[PDB]
Amino acid sequence: MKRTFQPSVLKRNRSHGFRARMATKNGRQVLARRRAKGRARLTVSK
Amino acid sequence: AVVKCKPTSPGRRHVVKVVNPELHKGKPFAPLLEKNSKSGGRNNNGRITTRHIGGGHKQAYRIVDFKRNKDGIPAVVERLEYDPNRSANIALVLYKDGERRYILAPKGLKAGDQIQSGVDAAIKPGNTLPMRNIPVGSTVHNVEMKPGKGGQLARSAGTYVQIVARDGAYVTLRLRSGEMRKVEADCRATLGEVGNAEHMLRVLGKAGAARWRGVRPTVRGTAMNPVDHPHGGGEGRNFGKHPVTPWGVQTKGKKTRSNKRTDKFIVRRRS
RNA sequence: AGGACCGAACCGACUAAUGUUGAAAAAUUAGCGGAUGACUUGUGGCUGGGGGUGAAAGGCCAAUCAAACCGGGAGAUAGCU
RNA sequence: GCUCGCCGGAAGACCAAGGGUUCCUGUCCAACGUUAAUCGGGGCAGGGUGAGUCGACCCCUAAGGCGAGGCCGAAAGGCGUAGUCGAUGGGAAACAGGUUAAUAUUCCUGUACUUGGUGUUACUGCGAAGGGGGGACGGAGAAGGCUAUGUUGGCCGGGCGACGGUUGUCCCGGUUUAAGCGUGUAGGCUGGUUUUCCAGGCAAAUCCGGAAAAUCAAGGCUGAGGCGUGAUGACGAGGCACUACGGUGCUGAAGCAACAAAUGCCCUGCUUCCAGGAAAAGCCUCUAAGCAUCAGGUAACAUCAAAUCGUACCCCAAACCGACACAGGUGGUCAGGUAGAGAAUACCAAGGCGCUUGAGAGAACUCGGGUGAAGGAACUAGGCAAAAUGGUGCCGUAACUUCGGGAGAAGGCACGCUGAUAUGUAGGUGAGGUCCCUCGCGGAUGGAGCUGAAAUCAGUCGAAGAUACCAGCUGGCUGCAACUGUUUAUUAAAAACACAGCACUGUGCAAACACGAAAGUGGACGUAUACGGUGUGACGCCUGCCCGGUGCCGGAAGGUUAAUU
RNA sequence: AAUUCCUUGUCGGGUAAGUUCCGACCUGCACGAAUGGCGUAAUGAUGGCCAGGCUGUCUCCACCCGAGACUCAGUGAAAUU
């Protein structure tokens, strides 16, 4: 049975990567929220 | 001509083809080709604006000369070619100076025929002249709505226009739809009729034939839920309401023309 | 020549049994349909919630859909238990 | 270690994606492993991934993304030009052998190849953000010529048989060699060369396009394989001294032919069809502004450079996606033997495995199967399930029909083995010889050798010869839908949806319409034989009556009627 | 009749026996002509019905071959309360 998650590093980076988040104001606010929470890993960079 | 396929299998029983041996059995003139990517009926927002568009055979656009502004240079038809972008056929014409161009094929135009453009050209099919020089009552195609912007009317398989009167600056036209429209008597037009008259006689014969053209299936609307179409659902087949678009307009006589900008070039509408 | 025929790969899911704290949050076994096409598949892209997409079942939109998910208004209100 | 069983179009081999040390060695057995464990994809420690040629990076662009100015929008922001990004596509070059416990087209040996920098010599019109060419493209089908590969013979080495026979028409094994370079063949495409002229290619042009003459018929391009060389090498079944019985030096014979043959190659070809089948750069040319006893360009030789990152291992799975060492899912490449139409199926080779609880017993009952007296649907909502049919050739085949079908209708007959026809025929392949020749990878002739159906006749064994696996039950009446298709992922595959066809209606192009506060985009680089909406649903015969109601389309006289005044 | 309540309408066919099926009749509760009417060859994992063949579907179950069940050793759940 094919499941929902089909990993792809390229698609992962261009969907939730650091540069993708910085491209839009809403994505920038996501980083700000995570920084305020003290997240150890801001995005799915690596 | 029109040939009816034999009923060797279902899907070929009702197939009627229109085979024209005069067409070129080879690749088109490469310099006059451009990329033509399919849209799928979606605009720059990515939303389906026009429904029932998608798929179909890959096509390459042909640069067809709709202005015919090369005046005083005779041209000779090289060959007739099949155009996937339109119902009519295009003709490759070679000018005396060595330039090649694509034009819509008139009714009785064949290889080796001579055509010309400009006020001094003769009154023969394929020649382009302003309406001022066109004798009244003659049949023309590829009519220009405005001077110099390229032909826009009567460019389909077997359509044409009739010049009924010339009231000085303006010339009245009988568009094949029925309008007695009038345009300025300076717009270029081509003599004769666009020759593919047998095109309308074509019968696709099967569902897959339509899909080749890029036409996706049409869902009626009565066979739909109320949340989707105004016609909506019901236990069985009810349809107890006036016919209407998916967005709420009559579609059974309700005129939708609300331009009002011109209102001057329309002598009569239709019918 | 063919949305042609028989039939593997491939894509489907008509019948039956088993399983039903399963090997498996839909599968296995034996049969079954399509199998040059309106076919199928890899990679990438596009359409975002009263919106999308839909050969149209209210189907599908991350095991969730007659209005997704996450956070917030919020300790909504509950003549009810 | 010896047997046994299983997969073998994989349950083998190599990758992408994904994972990220699971790889190799030593060591340990608490936990993890559905049991034990000395073992492990477990713990701990060490080692392991060597590239000018492989991939990425890089150059080029598709869909699409972003987008200086710009247009639009309360703000946020939206769209988009010039541009700049974006592979799943295009663009220079390495092969064979050997080698590590673990890497190699990356190291080693041998033999090559590509693109640039610089220098020298010779000869020289060079120059682009421009022009042209090229790159550059579909489906289906048909062969022909090849190769991978296989079989047999020959050749070389070894063998003479645990039990009758086995020195022969016997048995086992081997019989392998690349890129590159040279040759330019089967075959495909195109008439060459020279001069003059020209409203075209945004300007120019010797290039491209066009026109007009003369002169020759042989020019050019493309092209699998074969052959030669590479190769006096390498490899090589087996030997000979070392030989921790773990392995290395040295030596190492034959290394040919015929036939069969691809889904691979010639082929981005050819033929045919309609649904008419990317872009850009590299590359090849053309000149412009410019630079000219320069600079640049071409050729030879010399020299230098080719960085950086990935490279282990799994990759139909115990390492990826499924919470699991989970009967699931997962793209590409390789494709042996016998039988077979076949990548089905059966048994096997190479290779890999016996699926991480076992040992007994041989109750009911459950599960998956085998056989069955007589009857044969009496079962049951229902022939559910099971049983049965099943191949090739020939004969034969109804109503009905849109003349294609129905149809493999139904039904019947023959199938093994041996011999002969014919010590292997028809056919296919094709050596030597001879003749010809533009003396070549040539043509003709020639038929050796090899390969090889099918049929007839006769004889013969069994209960059964399409003996296994594999492999249509058939016929009659009838409702619905024309048909192939589509649909509720996960109780509904249908008579539902689509459908070709038909009709009504809107729409003259800045189209209707749709998405958008707007700009704009789709419709469409389309133009009424077009496009949108609605209903009906192939085809055949047809589609009657009603305009009071509702809607829609027209109408002008009157009545009533908003802001405003 | 995919439409008929009364209703298993009535007659005929098929069966020893037919609320289904097929062919007629018309008293159409409550068919009807593009939300189409009536036919229709071919097609269908479509609905109904009847035959031949075939059989453990059944009269009526018997035996046999395997995996569980049972015993021994090791490991070791669950709902519920």
UniProtKB/Swiss-Prot annotation, chain A:
Gene3D superfamilies: 1.10.287.3980. InterPro entries: Ribosomal_bL34 (IPR000271), Ribosomal_bL34_CS (IPR020939). One of its GO terms (molecular function) is structural constituent of ribosome. GO terms for biological process: translation. GO terms for cellular component: ribonucleoprotein complex; ribosome. It comes from the Bacteria. The keyword Ribosomal protein applies. NCBIfam families: rpmH_bact. Belongs to the bacterial ribosomal protein bL34 family. This is Large ribosomal subunit protein bL34.
UniProtKB/Swiss-Prot annotation, chain B:
The modification N6-acetyllysine is found at K241. Residues 38-47 have a biased composition (Low complexity). GO terms for cellular component: cytoplasm; cytosol; cytosolic large ribosomal subunit; DnaA-L2 complex. Pfam families: Ribosomal_L2 (PF00181), Ribosomal_L2_C (PF03947). Belongs to the universal ribosomal protein uL2 family. Part of the 50S ribosomal subunit. Forms a bridge to the 30S subunit in the 70S ribosome, contacting the 16S rRNA. Interacts weakly with S6 in one of the 3.5 A resolved structures. In pull-down experiments interacts with CedA. This is Large ribosomal subunit protein uL2. It comes from Escherichia coli (strain K12). The gene is rplB.
